Design a protein around this ligand. Structure first.
Ligand SMILES: NC(=O)c1ccc[n+]([C@@H]2O[C@H](COP(=O)([O-])OP(=O)(O)OC[C@H]3O[C@@H](n4cnc5c(N)ncnc54)[C@H](OP(=O)(O)O)[C@@H]3O)[C@@H](O)[C@H]2O)c1
Ligand code: NA
Ligand code: NA
Ligand code: NA
Ligand code: NA
Lengths: 499, 499, 499, 499
């Protein structure tokens, strides 16, 4: 709309969003309905590309896109990204509305995501802190005497950005930004569930000057994307999604550069010396934000005996005083879950917990096909480990609360889930904190705050089932870039005199 | 022998080498014969572990090895590696003999490899140049104000080191070194073809004090190793081998940290201003060393019109004046190829070349089941691209020679193979060299020298089919280590006053 | 004017520019006339501060400025600098006019300097590439086991920026930028010769939001500034000027953090394989730009026998075809020298050269008190070393030309001057270039281009008499920042288990 | 002795140690007596060099030493340093004895210093972590498009190492190590008070293979050394000593690279949540070690109301139960102070404290010309600031104890001394610690441990009157090295296609 005026086709009353085929918007594959979790109604349709168009798109990205991206100097790439930030920023309300509608994201969250996307774009300048190369003098070994080395980063070529439904706008902009800033072409494949924000972002980027043949947006459902991942013209795959799909992706892709942000939930530990007001507030928010549909959502709360009571009490109060419903109301604190299935699973997971000795301390009530109350289930340490809510990631606003004797048990229980994305620790004692930081097997630990990846100012990523590699300003360079070593031989050439 | 006095079992006149099961040498799986390429005779047997022992070994590595390695401070780890270097160095002749016998490596090459292994071990101190972490101040964004970050490296746990036959000693020592120096446990799986050097190295390491439950040596043939790669207790897989196996490995392994050094050959470019004496000498050596059974061997020579003649002439002379035969003779320049099959393929590849317009300029004569002459086949640019020797990696002492008009054609032809490991460029003009460095799609470019990874003083690794990620002193940290981000929240705590 | 509407006082027909006293513009010290080199006419007056005001200003900078600068978060500091860039950019013509008038800078050079200042301000974001700190794990030594270190950069406090006359605008903006971006307060002391551009820049910065008590502009003549340098509240002194004053500054300042950019000229070497069109063009420009009043101006040209003739011929032609005169004419290539004295010295230096066997190849004619022709004096290698033009820096558009047998003699002669700022080398052979790069004792070597510090995209600074330390985007952090090491002791605390 | 068998001359019953003149041991200047603080008796004599020999030595260091050091490859330099470590280690008892005798250092401290020197030498390998250079791509600005930069470190040439009396062995070995590892020649000028350990170290280095013309040991008293510092052949001055001499050194030296470690004492802060056993123990030791003749000695103890009593009580007990006397007795905890003057000043400083309201809590008794008891003087916050013990550095085992209300007052009082070397903070709360770390104006803060520079595993150095720049493994490179920037111009050369 406006930004997409010439792109969208209103066929039979429903806006039809086409795929961007590295040059022209189009697509002659099956059309797919995009629905809102707010009312299960179809709000648009996306045109998937045919196998022939996928193939043609990859060919363009590979034969020309790599070069258009690479041959645009960084100073210009930065201008493109800054311009795109401006376009998105002036179309903020439009971007947010689509997030609220297409993702069921509360207005404030949708606005925050648009702003995150804008900031990410504007701070592409900070990604340069990890851009320089290394100069290795060769006289520190006899075999390399009169020799010298230069190690540089080079873009890999075509990066496939596969994105999840819970951050349809930001994830796509983030991956495109760090992939492009370093000189790569990019194939974005958004969740077929809410692909509208990506289409809007890609349009803003194209309007900003992004090399037209260096980007592609393909509306392909699940396994249709395998064809992209398995293709040799795709040198890297930046994937943010579930562990299970991530696994399938690597198995389909084979040898290639990967960044796998596979989520799972996050445990939060509260030491006896923690500021419980701060802790309860951050933990409650960590549990419910975007209806827990955040990879960094809190799924397990571990608190030492002496503060467990108050802490769990406060979090319960906070979760209970939340307003659920339609996200269009800036009154609502919690909108719907992406699908009735996600709610089904959450309900089943809560029953499992209750059956295994668990007790609901807040929530528990399903309010409709896609609506539920943020639930907080207490569980005894000796039984929690077998609970579905512990063993798995229930993508919903639901967390377990478990009282623990001391730090070692908290740590042990925190490390007992199969995931290792982030962990939170509230407390003040440097020694206990240092111990926790050392022993928690996670990509990131947040001291005195809820886990929040934000725009990646600080790098993040998983351990164990949560994946491999990191995303972040500067650090993402490792996933979309390859080193290039140049060794110079001056043996006997008179540069050095035996040294 | 001596180092392995209590380990090896002389059963029926043939030394029987057992697997090391992270604690004790043993194995109750099938026994497998190890033969010498020098005479196709069985020189020993290795005991493969049973499925039960593989499983038990992994369990030990995971439950205890990770901790024994990690909980040994770096200063002690360095002492272990230095001690191991001493043990290997005093047993040099024994190490070299086994290389000559088991791998068919010429005496000087076998001695050089033992020395490379010793140096690698002693320079583990240089790997620390990439060990420190990053401190990220948070006041460069509003959302992160009064926040701070620490980014650190942490060992992944259990690294599976899969090694090729062409550098049985060094590769195993290299992977063990960089995996261990950072605190990881390691499962070494050597080529079942020549696993004796690894067994000797692992023994020297164990004698040096390497945590007995933090290392394992498993004599498993090909697909028997899949069980290790596919296991979740294996957090990283450092693989050096062929593209095809590398592909299978990732597909079996799924999401995990990988370093894939997949070889392929290397092209060498000679500019009109090159010192042709240096070039011919380095190129000849690059073609024949260890009977071309080097991932960094020269497989294609591209020379500009004006020097093509002399260059190809000189390389031909040099290859022709080489002494082939048994590697025990310090007289021999070239020993045998690892198997009669490898020679078969080389012969077939030479015929293919000849049929497509190629002309042998040196060699071409097979001298026995496992012996051949270093061959240099000239080919016209317009036909070389379809030749098996160009399209594939023929692991043998054989290279193609192709005359080219200019740098652009040399570069184009060099980039036309499916591999991108290293490339060599002989010439003096900075501009032409810089252009070549920019356009050659390889992990490493050697200016005025033949490609030689050495001990990894300079990082190396592939592009395209040659794999992903790099190995090298300092740089290998990226493959066996994961980042850990710790974010500290001091918002409103009075550390800063709005800043 | 406009930007300075409320600041400047028109007393007796001459605009009177007051000093900025870290809070308010003013000054009750002697008034000093500012003249134009274009016509020796007084174009303005500057009010110097009294001893009491200097003292009061320092007190404010120290007691409040350090904190205003430091307590403004970086994100805001960046906004200030970007805003200042905008203000200067919209007032470009006004900034340039003052440069042309006050410095005698040709219009295109004055415009280029304003743009350099604007870019420097906008790229302050790139200075962050060197901002993070280091995390040092402690288990690599026994004495530091269970210990850990964090190394961070911290602003020093009050940086005294002393600037030269030849880049009155840029130098002041550069020093203020890198000093401020890291959290320092700044006392700018411009050349009393052309202090108007600094006053304008400081006003733009104040209008942009620069903490009013964190900056000071003091119009003090020469030794009046010693009082600032010698003060203990001044933690660092960023000085760009002559060797002799630089020496006096350190001797007055004593222990303190220093960056001393002390110029001197630069030698240029032309190898036999150099593109002589490029060389002659760049060298000619390097000799005459801003009437040679550039620290990086070419003062000596060394060319190998085979190209000496053509090279010197071409440079002579180019210097001869230059238009001298008043800088207001966009027709003029060369304006006047800052003072009649500077011309006197140049004439004397040319006579000295001629007397010692030197021969003028272009120029030599003085055209007025402050006007002269760009002069190129040929000199025999065996006599040049004793020539004033070689031994000293004659700040004027004058260079010596000396034929040399080979690289070694060029290098020897290039290193024979007492300075070591930059050096230029035109040629293509990597070996000769590498040798030159190794042996030239200078802070920076420019391959195939004239020396040009630009905005410091690449760090620069001197060796020998040219000073110490470097300025540059990112690198200047070392001069206005101090490290802060935090060592954490966890011995026996149970974080690690013997490691 | 033994190591110095052919060097030392027994003239008139007293061993006569000559200076090392970059080639030969000798000296024809005045002879100077070296006395022991243990009994004021002359234990040896040192021959100072004549003005002619100083001049000749500098000439050798400059004309040949720079090259011998630089032209010895790093791999060999490392071998020299490792060999020297071996020589010193096998002569440990001899090295320690001279420390005990010449410096009055307790046996355990003397042994610890020899070991520190040995370790420093062996870990020279860790200094390489800061040796590589930077590669700066040029397409991030329009003016630098098609341009590229390489930034490298280069040795400065001749480094003058001026050392203090309190660590005669280590300081000399440290400065020589970091100066030499990077390729510099070195003039060591030890305290004329105890120059014997330096002579022994220099001999071990020469025996180890240290280029004979790249090192010099000059026995010059105080201002005789100015001649070295003021010389232009001296590119850097690494000085560890008092603020006042440091000031004189820079004023004599002028523009040059400096590292000024100017000591002063260190304050220690004890928060209410500190482990007081650890604190009292570390603080007591920090106060008395080597009779407080440590730049990092604790001179001021600040403790919050609630723990002040116990803390000061415990430290008093510990200081009181110390055994003073002759250092030869391994029984003694505290030997003598370097001179009767140092004791005089300490006594006067204690009286001043008492007169201003201070009360001795331990010690106070002078036991002889050079012996005293470790003294702990309590002082009220409102009067301490004017006490000599606070305002100055009394180089003796004496510290002030001051009770404080909270962290802010502790910090304020800690920052009130004119020095800023290190500071110690005992406590557990992360927020209070972070605040302290931010506000303490010192080069280094030690959390939960006494300040101990050790061998510089962690970098250290001063703020304010404590000097400028840092020493440390890796970090010292900045003081004895200069950057060298090489900019390559490929504009229009076809390397890049507009990028
Ligand atoms: N890129 C580099 O830096 C580099 C360096 C050296 C060599 N190379 C390349 O690697 C090859 C070396 O020779 P190679 O013949 O030994 O090649 P390879 O067969 O690919 O070596 C494979 C290694 O993987 C094991 N393996 C085989 N199938 C496996 C499977 N299905 N699952 C798990 N592991 C399996 C092999 O054991 P078995 O021996 O039991 O089959 C062997 O240890 C050449 O192509 C060379 O160019 C590359
Ligand atoms: Na694949
Ligand atoms: Na897997
Ligand atoms: Na001073
Ligand atoms: Na001087």
């Amino acid at each position: 709309a406006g930004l997409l005026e010439g792109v969208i086709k209103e066929k039979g009353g429903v806006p039809v969003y086409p795929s961007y085929l590295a040059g022209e918007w189009g697509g002659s594959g099956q059309e797919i309905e995009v629905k809102s979790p707010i009312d299960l109604a179809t709000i648009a349709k996306v045109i998937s590309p045919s196998r022939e168009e996928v193939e043609r798109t990859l060919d363009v990205l590979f034969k020309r896109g790599r070069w258009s991206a690479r041959d645009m100097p960084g100073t210009e790439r930065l201008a493109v990204l800054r311009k795109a930030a401006d376009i998105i920023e002036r179309n903020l309300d439009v971007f947010a509305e689509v997030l609220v509608m297409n993702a069921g994201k509360p207005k404030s969250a949708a606005v925050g995501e648009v702003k995150a996307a804008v900031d990410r774009l504007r701070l592409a300048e900070l990604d340069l802190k990890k851009i320089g190369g290394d100069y290795i003098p060769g006289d520190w070994t006899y075999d390399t005497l009169e020799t010298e080395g230069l190690v540089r980063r080079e873009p890999l070529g075509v990066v496939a950005a596969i994105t999840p439904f819970n951050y349809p706008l930001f994830d796509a902009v983030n991956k495109i930004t760090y992939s492009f800033i370093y000189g790569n072409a990019v194939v974005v494949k958004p969740s077929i569930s809410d692909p509208l924000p990506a289409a809007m972002a890609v349009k803003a980027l194209l309007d900003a000057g992004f090399p037209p043949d260096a980007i592609a947006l393909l509306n392909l459902p699940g396994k249709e994307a395998e064809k992209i991942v398995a293709d040799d013209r795709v040198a890297a795959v930046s994937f943010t999604g579930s562990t299970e799909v991530g696994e399938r992706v690597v198995k389909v892709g084979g040898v290639k550069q990967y960044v796998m942000e596979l989520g799972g939930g996050d445990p939060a530990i509260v030491l006896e010396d923690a500021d419980l007001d701060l802790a309860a507030d951050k933990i409650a928010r960590g549990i419910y934000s975007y209806a827990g549909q955040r990879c960094d959502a809190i799924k397990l709360v571990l608190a030492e005996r002496p503060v467990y009571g108050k802490l769990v009490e406060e979090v319960a109060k906070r979760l209970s005083s939340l307003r659920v419903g339609d996200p269009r109301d800036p009154t609502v604190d919690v909108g719907p879950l992406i699908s009735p299935s996600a709610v089904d699973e959450m309900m089943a997971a809560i029953e499992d917990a209750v059956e295994k000795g668990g007790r609901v301390l807040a929530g528990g009530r399903r309010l409709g096909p896609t609506y539920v109350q943020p639930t907080f289930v207490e569980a005894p340490a000796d039984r929690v480990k077998d609970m579905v809510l512990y063993k798995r990631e229930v993508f919903a606003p639901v967390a377990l609360a478990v009282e623990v004797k001391d730090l070692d048990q908290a740590i042990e229980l925190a490390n007992g889930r199969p995931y290792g994305l982030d962990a939170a620790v509230f407390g003040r004692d440097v020694v206990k904190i240092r111990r926790a930081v050392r022993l928690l097997e996670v990509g990131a630990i947040y001291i005195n705050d809820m886990p929040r990846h934000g725009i990646g100012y600080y790098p993040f990523g998983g351990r164990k089932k949560s994946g491999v590699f990191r995303e972040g300003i500067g650090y993402a360079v490792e996933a979309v870039t390859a080193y290039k070593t140049i060794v110079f031989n001056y043996k006997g050439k008179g540069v050095w005199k035996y040294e």
